[PDB]
Design a binder for this molecule. Structure first.
Ligand code: TGL
Ligand code: HEA
Ligand code: HEA
Ligand code: PC1
Ligand code: PC1
Ligand code: PC1
Ligand code: 3PE
Ligand code: 3PE
Ligand code: 3PE
Ligand code: 3PE
Ligand code: 3PE
Ligand code: CUA
Ligand code: CU
Ligand code: MG
Ligand code: NA
Ligand code: ZN
Lengths: 260, 44, 94, 227, 57, 76, 514, 47, 79
């Protein structure tokens, strides 16, 4: 009753500061892992940032569903901020694709002027990338089914849909690692290997983030957090996973069908 | 923008103190380093 | 039948209070632009406040780019300086 | 080659520099025009006493403020486009010389016939012979003959350098794995001084470029004699 | 898997002055204390390690 | 109606599609026994300018001895 | 109380206070780096021995005065104070990641300082151009620490951009549209959009460089099939946005100070003002190769990029002419911020025309990375962004803290600053035309005199900085309050109180019913 | 209210003692101005 | 033919200034000339002009590295 406006007043939280210093710890741990080969501070930084993100998102859930501070105009702000982060990462991967096409459209004299560079046979797109695309497209259509099950009000149906999607996503990650094991060449191996391993590895990190975010939204639903209208966790899940789907479609088409 | 009178007006000495202190104190680092730049250069 | 919980019995707090406000049709927490566009002396523009002192930003000509912000205090209907439309303050305590 | 109290550019050796300086004085007329304009208008707004703080009229002069700088920039950029087009016209490369920027120094190759390669460091301040110049003298000049367009293929071995001769009017960034093409032309014999213009490490300031421009016959005399 | 959100909600609108990031009892207070001691303890270890790299043996 | 349509597409299109793609890869992986290519020390492959910050510095993070030769050769 | 309020900050005003503190500290550090450069360049010969340490100092100067001074002062500080108070919002949209971006900036500065500490040094310049940053020329750690500081600054600016766009488009009062906000809100909105569509390109480039240094990838190694021209493409596709993030809040705050101290209740051509803001923001992307006129590009691409450079030149001219028009017919009150704004207008004009002279690629075939471009970006940056910063600093200080500034001492600070920085940056025209390339510690006879005059002017600028910080102390010691603020009916930030209370806009602004 | 507000009390430092404020501003800006000089003499000693 | 020039002329295939592609193509089709006319029995000295053009265009370190790669069998070209 003290606050007339419908916006949200955030209580003082330490986790901005602790996440900032965890980013400090992560960067320094990468420095002393690349140069002075010490794993310890890198592991400490990983633990700090993972734990800080854990209870930061715990606290934002606590003010969202346990206090009802996520007023619909704040929900509009959350949707805007999520879309802005998605388009920022779209431009991040667009810079990666710019690097790939700068390597691709003008093959250098070192590579023989031919793409793919000689000495490597690229993995064929016909079987395992089709399996990848089928998994991601099935995951996307299952997420759409789950969201419309939220629209209808069918909890059992969207639980089944979410377990199906998470099974597909973890299958995609494990066979992503499997073909990483079963590819003929590495990241430190040619400009082709460098660029597609960098792009696919950043995409693998992003689909790992999406899979864990699906774990969070499913475990929130299993504790009845989501409702029929205020389900921005699953809205962000659908948005992020469709971002993953379209980025994988772009990467698949470009890398696996251009110069392969 | 009209301004209310200074609650703690600074005297000629107070103004001198702040001005002189600021100049000398801020010049101290550079001055001392510049004076001993050769000494620092010495790998010794 | 219900399956997933529904927010009209699940959500509590500020979100619930403004859902109650939305379903009874009046907004006390400034979600929407206000009403009663009439700025005469005898019928000024009604401004709701939980206090006796509140900012109002008058766009006092149509499609005017710059806003004229000024305060309202409890009392007579203070008018916009560069146009002259009147505003009077009501306390809601909500 | 630069002189103390220098106001403009080092004087032209190439016709591309002659047109470059004519266009430079054109752009200088534009900047002085606009600067004098904004100075005098600013003095109007400082020194006036009348006030107009009313409801302004907006879209009455903005059409003039759109059409006037547009044609200003058009007549600026049309000589720019013309000069940029004539840098790479139909060339007759009578000679080809390639530069390889090495770690804080240069190497030069005249490989068109009887493959010739030499190096280029910078003559130290204490090792200078009397009468020379500081930081621009080089123990091995680059020998080229006048009145000829010579292809110059400029690359680097380790780090990005930048072959720059502001007297003759050239600057290309020497990038490893990519040789860039320039044309040298001259209307005057003698010595021209330039430097590396891209940062390359612990002695970036210590690699200049020196061009001695000689007649043809002395050029092949030097080339056949230095081996 | 039963519904215990509405009972968990009323453990979050206590007007006792306890802030939102410590309102979950004592367990989140211990997690707060542990992360506060270990980001700073990591930070002092990082600054010491950067100093040790900056001043070689 | 939307949720029922998406459920039907998932069960009758997406799941059979993943089944067919999995069967394709599974049959191929049983017939293909790839003839490891002969080692050629191409100067643009297996570049090592700095050791990796793990192991011996010469093995990649997802190294596979059967298919990924070192700058010197296969390990066998 | 202190740790709960400042270390655990959650409101935009205190977060902007901490921005101002960090910006002033970074300005002191960069000022000392500048006097280091000019003291080494005020004498022919090698004062510091080999100029590897000189490259370290120029890199540190560039990084701390760009990615630690002007962004956290204008984009961070001034915007983070103002735009909630400008639009009527109580707080910012995402104050938690606002505070995270803040308290993650000093780790980036600590990475910079420790990188300077490391023996390898940041001997790459402001650009971190490979293969100079590769393992052959900087086998060490300092370039990696600078790149990780670049990562941290990038993440902080990204989260700030998210928060700024969200608070601008969301917390408007519901009946006013997008085109009714004050000009600084529009400028910082275009600035934050430029941040959001620019910074991931920087992150891609610097992550790519990290993986080339450490993870043995060959993206910029031509012996591995890579290409450094990709790094100049990525870095300058971020670098002309860098320009326009550092400039556009300056446009907004100078527009506010000229329309405040000119007596106008309207800036001239506000609709065209916003058009020109969006125009230079949209063409900031497609002009990126004007820094690569000497790398060996196509003639057609060079022509297209210099033509687009004229097309991005024209709406900035619209901005300048609209500034003269909003100066026109106004009772110009001689407040020191007005003097700072006038200096900004003139010196921005001359720096921009120097930029046009650069933008002719036929001139950059001889003029690239001489001291002429140094004169360009110090005419337009060391006085553009800096003069804007002091204009907003001496304009909003009674709002920010509550203590006004003595007019005579503030104009004194402006006077020493103006004459010193003009004497500093006018001779590099002659240095560049004579042809002294960038990042040189030592310099011959033909550049000796002008370099000496610039060094003396830089020491005058140091004296001006001392006057500024004495002025800060004098305000903090005199502690005079504000009797009244004129034009508070138009400026929303001033009417809430000098200084405003901790929780602003607990009552939302009654927007017009219409 | 919960945080004290007023002219000059919203700063993280104290304002009441002008000489104490002078001393702490002096050590703050002196550390800021002296940091890169101490850097460059550190590499001069190291090299 | 048996043309005797002093310097390699302007090639209209690459009007731009990035002539490393010009030297790369010259060296590639010079070796293609060698293999083709040694297979067909034609005169190998027809593309001595190709030899002279790649020697004139791209640097001695590059051509020495490429010749060593050709000689001990690790070349990335289509030769
Ligand atoms: C509250 C009650 C008193 C608490 C103890 C105060 C003294 C110790 C302290 O924690 O002191 C507080 C700290 C605050 O510092 C930080 O928080 C570190 C930031 C990095 O003070 C510093 O470290 C030095 C600051 C010196 C003066 C700087 C002036 C800057 C002028 C430009 C901005 C004006 C903005 C006006 C608006
Ligand atoms: C404050 C930062 C800032 C700003 C605003 C600008 C603005 C501009 N810059 Fe610059 N620039 C830099 C910072 C900046 N730049 C830096 C830091 C570098 C080099 C970095 C490095 O090399 O590593 C650089 C380099 C740089 C180069 C490369 C030079 C070289 O090294 O070869 C070029 C050339 O195209 C250029 C052009 C321009 C142009 C055309 C503008 C314009 O936007 C200026 C517009 C301003 C105006 C005021 C317009 C003029 C209009 C009028 C005066 C009105 C009247 C006009 C008419 C009637 C026609 N800049
Ligand atoms: C914001 C950017 C910025 C600013 C202000 C400056 C300011 C100055 N720069 Fe800067 N400079 C660059 C950005 C900047 N520079 C960049 C990007 C390069 C290229 C680096 C490279 O080549 O890699 C460069 C390069 C550069 C060189 C090239 C070195 C070389 O090539 O050998 C030189 C030398 O003369 C120089 C000198 C100066 C001087 C004398 C000032 C003076 O103007 C300093 C005076 C200005 C101030 C002191 C700012 C005011 C700050 C305060 C008063 C403190 C803040 C406190 C409050 C606001 C309360 N600069
Ligand atoms: C990982 C675990 C996610 C659990 C999600 C479901 C859940 O319990 O949510 C409530 C919890 C908070 O529960 P809580 O606030 O009701 O309290 C839990 C503690 N007890 C019950 C003992 C009082 O919220 C979260 O876990 C937030 C999601 C964290 C996501 C982390 C991702 C990986 C790291 C980055
Ligand atoms: C960071 C602060 C480091 C202070 C420090 O070590 O100072 C020692 C340095 C002295 O190291 P020094 O090596 O320059 O000392 C030579 C000069 N004598 C021996 C006469 C003292 O002290 C200063 O620079 C004085 C700072 C005054 C403020
Ligand atoms: C960048 C621009 C240029 C590049 C892009 C544009 C040009 C190229 C565009 C190509 C698009 C079409 C490619 C078709 C290729 C067909 C051949 C092929 O892949 O054969 C391999 C194989 C061949 O198998 P088959 O179909 O012959 O199998 C026969 C099986 N028996 C013998 C038992 C009868 O697979 C396929 O053809 C498709 C397999 C999957 C089909 C089912 C769909 C799975 C789920 C998908 C997602 C569903 C979401 C809902
Ligand atoms: C990389 C860093 C960025 C990762 C992606 C972040 C995406 C954030 C999306 C927006 C989060 C948010 O605030 O959502 C609002 C929501 C509260 O609203 P809601 O729960 O919908 O409503 C209650 C119903 N009455 O609140 C939430 O949903 C809170 C939970 C959101 C985040 C859950 C966990 C995500 C973990 C991602 C990183 C994982 C890192 C470790 C694994 C990978 C390691 C490489
Ligand atoms: C010598 C330095 C100390 C000088 C002290 C002094 O004379 O103080 C008196 C005066 C007070 O300030 P004053 O300039 O009068 O301020 C204008 C009011 N708006 O302060 C001054 O006049 C300051 C003079 C500084 C000269 C350098
Ligand atoms: C007042 C002028 C003070 C001055 O110039 O003192 C000389 C001194 C020279 O320093 P130096 O030669 O190192 O000898 C100091 C003794 N150890 O200078 C210094 O030590 C620097 C003094 C800087 C004063 C700035 C005010
Ligand atoms: C301020 C005006 C805008 C910026 C102009 C920058 C260009 C510049 O000043 O160039 C120097 C210019 C031309 O020099 P110039 O006299 O032609 O030298 C050769 C013959 N003596 O010479 C001049 O501009 C004249 C001297 C300075 C006048 C101011
Ligand atoms: C890497 C840093 C990730 C930081 C992050 O995502 O934090 C979550 C952030 C905080 O939630 P916020 O909306 O600010 O809370 C106030 C409303 N209750 O959440 C948000 O601000 C909304 C989602 C932003 C996602 C940004 C990811 C980076
Ligand atoms: Cu080579 Cu600088
Ligand atoms: Cu630019
Ligand atoms: Mg360059
Ligand atoms: Na020097
Ligand atoms: Zn009105």
């Amino acid at each position: 009753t003290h606050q007339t406006h419908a916006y949200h007043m955030v209580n003082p939280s330490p986790w901005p500061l602790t996440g900032a210093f965890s980013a400090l710890l992560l960067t320094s741990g990468l420095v002393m892992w690349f140069h002075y080969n010490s794993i310890t501070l890198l592991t400490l930084g990983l633990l700090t940032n993972i734990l800080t993100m854990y209870q930061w998102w715990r606290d934002v859930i606590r003010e969202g569903t346990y206090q009802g501070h996520h007023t619909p105009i704040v929900q509009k702000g959350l949707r805007y901020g999520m879309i802005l982060f998605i388009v920022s990462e779209v431009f991040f991967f667009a810079g990666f694709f710019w690097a790939f096409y700068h390597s691709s459209l003008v093959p250098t004299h070192d590579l023989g002027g031919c793409w793919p560079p000689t000495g490597i046979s690229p993995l064929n797109p016909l079987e395992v990338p089709l399996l990848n695309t089928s998994v991601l497209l099935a995951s996307g259509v299952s997420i759409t089914w789950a969201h419309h099950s939220l629209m209808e009000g069918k909890r059992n149906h969207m639980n089944q849909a979410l377990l199906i999607t998470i099974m597909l996503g973890l299958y995609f990650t494990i066979l992503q690692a499997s073909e990483y094991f079963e590819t003929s060449f590495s990241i430190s191996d040619g400009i082709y290997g460098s660029t597609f391993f960098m792009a696919t590895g950043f995409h693998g990190l992003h689909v790992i983030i999406g899979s864990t975010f699906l774990i969070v939204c499913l475990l929130r639903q299993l504790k009845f957090h989501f409702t029929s209208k205020h389900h921005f966790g699953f809205e962000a899940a659908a948005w992020y996973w469709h971002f993953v789907d379209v980025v994988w479609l772009f990467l698949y088409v470009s890398i696996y069908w251009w110069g392969s | 923008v009209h301004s209310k009178p200074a609650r703690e007006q600074l005297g000629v000495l107070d103004i001198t103190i702040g001005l002189t202190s600021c100049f000398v104190c801020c010049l101290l680092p550079a001055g001392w380093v510049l004076s001993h730049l050769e000494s620092y250069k010495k790998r010794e | 039948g219900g399956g997933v919980p529904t927010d009209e019995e699940q959500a509590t707090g500020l979100e619930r209070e403004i859902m109650i406000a939305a379903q009874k049709g009046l907004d006390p927490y400034n979600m929407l632009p206000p009403k009663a566009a009439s700025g005469t002396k005898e019928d000024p523009n009604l401004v709701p406040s939980i206090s006796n002192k509140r900012i109002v930003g008058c766009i006092c000509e149509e499609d005017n780019c710059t806003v004229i912000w000024f305060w309202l205090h409890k009392g007579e209907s203070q008018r916009c300086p560069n146009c002259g439309t009147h505003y009077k303050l009501v306390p809601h305590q909500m | 080659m630069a002189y103390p109290f220098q106001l403009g550019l080092q004087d032209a050796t190439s016709p591309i520099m002659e047109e470059l300086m004519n266009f430079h004085d054109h752009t200088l007329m534009i900047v002085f025009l606009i600067s004098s304009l904004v100075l005098y208008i600013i003095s109007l707004m400082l020194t006036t006493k009348l006030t107009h703080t009313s409801t302004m009229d907006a879209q009455e002069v903005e059409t003039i403020w759109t059409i006037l700088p547009a044609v200003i920039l058009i007549m600026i950029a049309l000589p720019s486009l013309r000069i940029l087009y004539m840098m790479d016209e139909i060339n007759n490369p009578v000679l080809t010389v390639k530069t390889m920027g090495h770690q804080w120094y240069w190497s030069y190759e005249y490989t068109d016939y009887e493959d010739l390669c030499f190096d280029s460091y910078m003559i130290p301040t204490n090792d200078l012979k009397p009468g020379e110049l500081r930081l621009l003298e080089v123990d091995n000049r680059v020998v080229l003959p006048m009145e000829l367009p010579i292809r110059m293929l400029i690359s680097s071995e380790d780090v990005l350098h930048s072959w720059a001769v502001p007297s003759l009017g050239l600057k290309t960034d020497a990038i490893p794995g990519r040789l860039n093409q320039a044309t040298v032309t001259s209307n005057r014999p003698g010595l021209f001084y330039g430097q590396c213009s891209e940062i390359c490490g612990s002695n970036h300031s210590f690699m200049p470029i020196v061009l001695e421009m000689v007649p043809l016959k002395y050029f092949e005399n030097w080339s056949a004699s230095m081996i | 898997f039963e519904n215990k959100v509405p009972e968990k909600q009323k453990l979050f609108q206590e007007d006792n002055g306890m802030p939102v990031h410590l309102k979950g009892g004592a367990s989140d207070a211990l997690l707060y204390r542990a992360t506060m001691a270990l980001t700073l303890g990591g930070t002092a270890y990082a600054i010491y390690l950067l100093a040790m790299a900056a001043f070689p043996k | 109606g939307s949720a029922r349509m998406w459920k039907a597409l998932t069960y009758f299109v997406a799941l059979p599609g993943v089944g067919v793609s999995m069967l394709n890869v599974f049959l191929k992986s049983r017939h293909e026994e790839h003839e490891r290519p002969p080692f050629v020390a191409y100067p643009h492959l297996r570049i090592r300018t700095k050791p990796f910050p793990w192991g011996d510095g010469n093995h990649t993070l997802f190294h596979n001895p059967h298919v990924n030769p070192l700058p010197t050769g296969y390990e066998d | 109380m202190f740790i709960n309020r400042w270390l655990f900050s959650t409101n935009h005003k205190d977060i902007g206070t901490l921005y101002l503190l960090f910006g002033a500290w970074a300005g002191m550090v960069g000022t000392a780096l500048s006097i280091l450069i000019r003291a080494e360049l005020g004498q022919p010969g090698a004062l510091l021995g080999d100029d590897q340490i000189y490259n370290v100092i120029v890199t540190a100067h560039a990084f701390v005065m760009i990615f630690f001074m002007v962004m956290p002062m204008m984009i961070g500080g001034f915007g983070n104070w103002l735009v909630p108070l400008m639009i009527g919002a109580p707080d910012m949209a995402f104050p938690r990641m606002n505070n995270m971006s803040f308290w993650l900036l000093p780790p980036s500065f600590l990475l910079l300082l420790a990188s300077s500490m490391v023996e390898a040094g940041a001997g790459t310049g402001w650009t971190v151009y490979p293969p100079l940053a590769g393992n052959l020329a900087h086998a060490g750690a300092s370039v990696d620490l600078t790149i990780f500081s670049l990562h941290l600054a990038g993440v902080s600016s990204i989260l700030g951009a998210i928060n700024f766009i969200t608070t601008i488009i969301n917390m408007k009062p519901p009946a006013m549209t997008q085109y009714q906000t004050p000009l600084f809100v529009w400028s910082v909105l275009i600035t934050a959009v430029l941040l959001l569509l620019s910074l991931p390109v920087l992150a891609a480039g610097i992550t790519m460089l990290l993986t080339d240094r450490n993870l043995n990838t060959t993206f910029f190694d031509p012996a591995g099939g890579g290409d450094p021209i990709l790094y100049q493409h990525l870095f300058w596709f971020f670098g002309h946005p860098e320009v326009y993030i550092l400039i556009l809040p300056g446009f907004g705050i100078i527009s506010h100070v000229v329309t405040y101290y000119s007596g106008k209740k309207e800036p001239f051509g506000y609709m065209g003002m916003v058009w020109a803001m969006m125009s230079i923001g949209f063409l900031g992307f497609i002009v990126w190769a004007h820094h690569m006129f000497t790398v060996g590009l196509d003639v057609d691409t060079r022509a297209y990029f210099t033509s687009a450079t004229m097309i991005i030149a024209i709406p900035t001219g619209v901005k300048v002419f609209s500034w003269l028009a909003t100066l026109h017919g106004g009772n110009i009150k001689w407040s020191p911020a007005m003097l700072w704004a006038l200096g900004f207008i003139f010196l921005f004009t001359v720096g921009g025309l120097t930029g046009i002279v650069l933008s002719n690629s036929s001139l950059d075939i001889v003029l690239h990375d001489t001291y002429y471009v140094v004169a360009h970006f110090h005419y337009v940056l060391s006085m553009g962004a800096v003069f804007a910063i002091m204009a907003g600093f001496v304009h909003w200080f009674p709002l920010f803290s509550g203590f006004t500034l003595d007019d005579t001492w503030a104009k004194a600070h402006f006077a020493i600053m103006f004459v010193g920085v003009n004497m500093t940056f006018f001779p590099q025209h002659f240095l560049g035309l004579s042809g002294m390339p960038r990042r040189y510690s030592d310099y011959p006879d033909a550049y000796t005199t002008w370099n000496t005059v610039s060094s003396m002017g830089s020491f005058i600028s140091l004296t001006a900085v001392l006057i500024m910080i004495f002025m800060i102390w004098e305000a903090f010691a005199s502690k005079r309050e504000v009797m009244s603020v004129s034009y508070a009916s138009t400026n929303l930030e001033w009417l809430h109180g000098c200084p405003p209370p901790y929780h602003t806009f607990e009552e939302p602004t009654y927007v017009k019913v219409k | 209210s919960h945080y004290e507000e007023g002219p000059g009390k919203n700063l993280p430092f104290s304002v009441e003692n002008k000489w104490r404020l002078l001393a702490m501003m002096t050590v703050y800006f002196g550390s800021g101005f002296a940091a890169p000089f101490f850097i460059v003499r550190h590499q001069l000693l190291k090299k | 033919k048996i043309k005797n020039y002093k310097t390699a002329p302007f090639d209209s295939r690459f009007p731009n200034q990035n002539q490393t592609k010009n030297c790369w193509q010259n060296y590639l089709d010079f070796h293609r000339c060698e293999k083709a006319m040694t297979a067909k029995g034609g005169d190998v000295s027809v593309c001595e002009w190709y030899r002279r053009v790649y020697k004139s265009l791209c640097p001695v370190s590059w051509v020495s590295a490429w010749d060593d790669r050709i000689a001990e069998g690790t070349f990335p070209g289509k030769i």
